[PDB]
Write a protein that binds this ligand. Structure first.
Ligand SMILES: CC(=O)[C@H]1CC[C@H]2[C@@H]3CCC4=CC(=O)CC[C@]4(C)[C@H]3CC[C@]12C
Ligand SMILES: CC(=O)[C@H]1CC[C@H]2[C@@H]3CCC4=CC(=O)CC[C@]4(C)[C@H]3CC[C@]12C
Ligand SMILES: CC(=O)[C@H]1CC[C@H]2[C@@H]3CCC4=CC(=O)CC[C@]4(C)[C@H]3CC[C@]12C
Lengths: 225, 225, 225
């Protein structure tokens, strides 16, 4: 009767429980033992973006790209491969311009010209965003109150952390990610697969990721000979 | 030619039509003949939340939990099992603290620290939300105009009804559901499966549901001996 | 080691790349060689909606429907088949009333009573929306700035184009689509399948599409005898 249905539902819930739990455990295991080859550090990127946050965010874009090319030659994409690509993830819609991406790091420009917001994602990667323009509202897990950050501030999305994020129209930021980068792809592409059906955007995303990987491989080969 | 393609599309549309129609019919059949064991009633919960809506919503949270424990001993989770868990569903993102959940009822605290909104869901369950803080905008099906509710009001999401819901930053409410509760899970988890990929949140959700079910089973066993 | 993982990821990315690329190529091939039987034209619909944008959007709805019935008898649904149906797509939620739909064209009323926004979709179809009330913000691909349109304006979503769209509460518009209409269905239903689980709305959507197709077939049969 009712007790039988309660017990059966409890059994199925425990099934889903152990499935999700072992998925989380595997994510932790793959992430912790992942490689950690670091060309950049988040403080360098944050300071460089903060210095230029008072300028027009596109002038700041240019200046930051030029500085990153000067300080890390061989690790930033040429002008021919820079492209603004929409990003639909976790219920929000923004756009990115990828500057660098390896197995363990990535650097990009990110933002939005529309009001948007949603789930931040939960992956084995430390993400950091320095606002050039607009406002970034972060609502952390386990709290009932949120915080709003402004140009020049840096929000650090910690490893394993999950938040709600919200950006206002005209919000632009410099983003640096460090960790097990491929484990973020499932989050970054899911709304494209199950919501937007925008396969050309998927094409653009994997194209720029592959080009960044090929640049890193080419620079590694040159550094070894 | 063109007529052939029109006819083929019409055939496939009629296929999808009868599939969805029989799905709706099965939802109605499972829901109507579902059990209706009721520990609470929506008027009791609404009045208790309305009385305290003028206080800070966290003080109200505490007072409502204490009253519910006093009036329904054995049917509310202990302090050790209370937890704020994100909820991503129907395009919106909020967070919940589950107080009670059986096969036929549930009681929780719900709200959001970000501006959000989306589809309410359509399930065989009567849902009711009493606002402690913020604003709740409801847009009913078949109308071109929406309504905004304020602290102390109660919105009743009727059985089989579908609306668009929208909450402003800092909106918090007491929610009571009555009907065939498991038929809501597919709606409550879908954005987690196909959008956020946040498997630890899924873990938390099934964990608290299972604990609430086990509490109900334990109290039933004690009441029978 | 690290180079092996980089190479394997590059291989898998190239796999996803060629899959998405050939999907886009097939979309282009199916769209270009698709039929182009045109009962309406977008300038006619835009001018008719612009003329009435200064009136209450429901009075405008009625006047536009009456004019479209007068000028295109046999191609607009009778009063008995008009229905407001929710539309959840690309992360946004609005509602539509379908007036006309064939293999190559469609005419509908669209809008929203909630603040919403998301991905526009990318399909082989030229879409055009004339605002009767509210505001329509369009953010085009490849740009960091967006534009806001007002009552009486027409936004043209070009074939193959992808934008972010955003509508404010109380925004209502007349929409005309021309191209390969079925290729939009996957976008229009995806959030229903993977997010809202609202199968009765899916039922309503395929029902009105099938009725519009049957009306077009019946008028074609009458015109041929
Ligand atoms: C804005 C944001 O949430 C970040 C978090 C993880 C980031 C992704 C990290 C992996 C990645 C590398 C690429 O080369 C393409 C862009 C993507 C897919 C990034 C897009 C922006 C993301 C999704
Ligand atoms: C806020 C909201 O829409 C409500 C409607 C149905 C509710 C769900 C009802 C079933 C359920 C019981 C649980 O024990 C976990 C929370 C959930 C999954 C509830 C989360 C909040 C929901 C999704
Ligand atoms: C508002 C919007 O984006 C438009 C773009 C393509 C449009 C769809 C085009 C195909 C279609 C025809 C129908 O008969 C049902 C409604 C739908 C499913 C339309 C709903 C509104 C859509 C989704």
């Amino acid at each position: 009767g009712r007790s039988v249905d309660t017990m059966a539902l409890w059994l199925g819930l425990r099934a889903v429980l152990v499935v999700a739990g072992l998925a989380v455990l595997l994510q932790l295991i793959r992430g912790w033992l992942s490689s950690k080859s670091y060309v950049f550090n988040r403080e360098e990127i944050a300071r460089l973006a903060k210095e230029h946050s008072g300028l027009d965010y596109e002038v700041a874009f240019s200046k930051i790209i030029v500085e990153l090319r000067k300080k890390h030659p061989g690790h930033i994409l040429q002008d021919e491969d820079l492209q603004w690509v929409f990003v639909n993830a976790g219920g929000w819609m923004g756009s990115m311009c990828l500057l660098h991406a390896s197995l363990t790091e990535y650097v990009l420009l990110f933002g939005t010209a529309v009001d948007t917001g949603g789930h931040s994602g939960r992956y084995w990667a430390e993400i950091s965003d320095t606002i050039l323009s607009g406002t970034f509202r972060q609502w952390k897990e386990g709290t009932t109150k949120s915080e709003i950050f402004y140009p020049g501030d840096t929000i650090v999305h910690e490893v394993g952390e999950a938040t709600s994020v919200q950006w206002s129209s005209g919000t632009w930021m410099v983003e640096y990610g460090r960790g097990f980068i491929p484990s973020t792809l499932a989050f970054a592409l899911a709304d494209t697969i199950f919501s937007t059906q925008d396969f050309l955007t998927l094409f653009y995303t994997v194209k720029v990721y592959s080009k960044a990987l090929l640049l890193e491989a080419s620079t590694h080969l040159s550094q070894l000979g």
